[PDB]
């Protein structure tokens, strides 16, 4: 069971209005024959065009929604829409263009899915809510075969040049013509009861129906997002590394052990409730607190309502103390905690569009987090940057140039001159603090936290 066989049957009754008397009994070999596509027993790492729904599901930064709408089929001129917002239309003689032969529009599409996956995927699946024209309007910009590498570079062939007769990866394709070897998937086929939009309408408000080709496009995407990472979770599947992985959750691990370590010197709360990852360690081990654990997996359709999380009768007394919601989405925080909220509008490769307002996130497993709400942090105020350190002054084992800052919480910077060490430190964790905060995370605290507070923690 690793690839979707091509004698597996495809339910035809969506496609009968575009395609009438379109036999019920219909097998993938048959489908893509009646494509336009010759497969030729070809065992070359190709081996059918469309995909299953957990072969989808670890290529999700391929995810292209693509939807074509007749405008008036060889007679008629095509609207082509896709995920990305655009619609071209070609003719056989929201961003709306005019009417081109195919010839050029194969080059716009081969651009435009370079652009937009070159830094996301090795491939693109176009993700469908088959009907007949997105099919059949395939041989018009899909060349298939055996499996290739590019003509500059060592990744996968998933595009091809007329032109100059050679194959490219989404990285070096300026020029290309078709798309080579794409991958597809009909959402229709997971079986549902009714059209489109009454489908993804039952989930998300944020996508509207404009009967453009790209809106439908959106809505097919959406629609596949939620049935495979909002109403089903997987946390086992792993993906790889496509950019700043790495540094963004070390400095996630930076940033919280500071953040709770820095609250209870200035304020001593005598216990912690630590609300969230039910596998969590207490990011503070040397603290005086009480550090009491309540579990919580990463909600990944509606933001918890605090109201579940806290009543229904544990310290239970949460007013007690401070609460730690790391990456733990709630509707509104109480006023004595400390928050990492991620934002759903941040612009980042690891950042998918999501279903309802909210982002699929993807480092190392996908996260399908809640619209983010600013409503939810009426009773905090926004944490500021500072950077807090007990530690020695002690260079040990780099070209220095004076460090002058007032959020260097040390007893160097107290004392008026901040140490090598400390600057060295300081300059490290602002580029940890950055990194995290431009990979779309947001930090809030209680009102009462004040940095000057700090300061005594050394006498
Ligand atoms: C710790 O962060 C990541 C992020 C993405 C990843 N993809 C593969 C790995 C390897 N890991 C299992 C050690 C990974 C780690
Ligand atoms: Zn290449
Ligand atoms: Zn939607
Ligand atoms: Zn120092």
């Not at 575009?18 to 009994?25: A, E, F, R, S, V």
């Not at 990472?229 to 919280?256: H, M, S």
């Not at 603290?287 to 990463?298: H, L, M, R, T």
Request: with cysteine; hydrophobic share 40%.
């Amino acid at each position: 069971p690793t690839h979707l066989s091509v004698d597996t049957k495809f339910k035809t009754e969506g496609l009968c209005v575009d395609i009438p008397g379109i036999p019920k009994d219909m097998t993938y070999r048959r489908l893509i024959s009646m494509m336009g596509f010759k497969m030729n027993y070809q065992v070359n790492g190709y081996p059918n065009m469309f995909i299953t729904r957990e072969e989808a599901i670890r290529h999700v930064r391929a995810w292209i929604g693509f939807d074509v709408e007749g405008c008036h089929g060889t007679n008629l001129p095509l609207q082509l829409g896709f995920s990305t917002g655009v619609n071209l239309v070609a003719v056989p003689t929201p961003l709306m263009y005019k009417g081109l032969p195919w010839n050029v529009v194969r080059i716009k599409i081969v651009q435009m899915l370079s652009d937009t996956l070159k830094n996301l995927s090795d491939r693109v699946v176009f993700v469908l809510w088959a009907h007949g024209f997105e099919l059949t309007s395939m041989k018009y910009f899909v060349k298939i075969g055996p499996e290739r590498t590019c003509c500059l570079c060592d990744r996968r062939a998933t595009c091809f040049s007329t032109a100059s007769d050679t194959y490219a990866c989404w990285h070096h394709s300026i020029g290309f013509d078709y798309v080579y070897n794409p991958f597809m998937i009909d959402v229709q086929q997971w079986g549902f009861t009714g059209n489109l939009q009454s489908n993804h309408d039952l989930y998300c408000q944020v996508h509207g129906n404009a009967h453009v080709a790209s809106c439908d496009a959106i809505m097919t995407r959406c629609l596949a997002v939620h049935e495979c990472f909002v109403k089903r979770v997987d946390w086992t599947i792993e993906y790889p590394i496509i950019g700043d992985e790495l540094k963004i959750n070390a400095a996630c691990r930076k940033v919280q052990h500071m953040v709770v370590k820095a609250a209870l010197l200035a304020d001593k709360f005598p216990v912690l409730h630590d609300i969230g990852n039910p596998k969590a360690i207490k990011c503070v081990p040397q603290a005086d607190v009480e550090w009491k654990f309540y579990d919580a997996q990463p909600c990944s359709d509606k933001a918890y309502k605090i109201e579940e999380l806290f009543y229904s009768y544990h310290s239970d007394k949460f007013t007690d103390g401070v609460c730690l919601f790391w990456n733990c989405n709630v509707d509104r925080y109480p006023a004595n905690s400390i928050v990492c909220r991620f934002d759903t509008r941040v612009l980042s490769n690891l950042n998918l569009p999501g279903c309802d307002g909210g982002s699929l996130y993807v480092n190392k497993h996908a996260f399908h987090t809640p619209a983010f709400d600013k409503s939810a942090f009426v009773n905090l105020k926004q944490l500021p940057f500072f950077y807090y350190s007990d530690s020695p002054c002690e260079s040990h084992g780099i070209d220095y140039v004076p460090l002058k800052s007032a959020t260097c919480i040390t007893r160097c910077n107290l004392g008026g001159a901040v140490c090598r060490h400390h600057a060295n430190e300081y300059r490290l964790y602002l580029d940890a603090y950055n990194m995290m905060i431009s990979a779309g995370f947001s930090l809030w605290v209680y009102k009462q936290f004040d940095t000057y507070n700090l300061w005594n923690t050394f006498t």
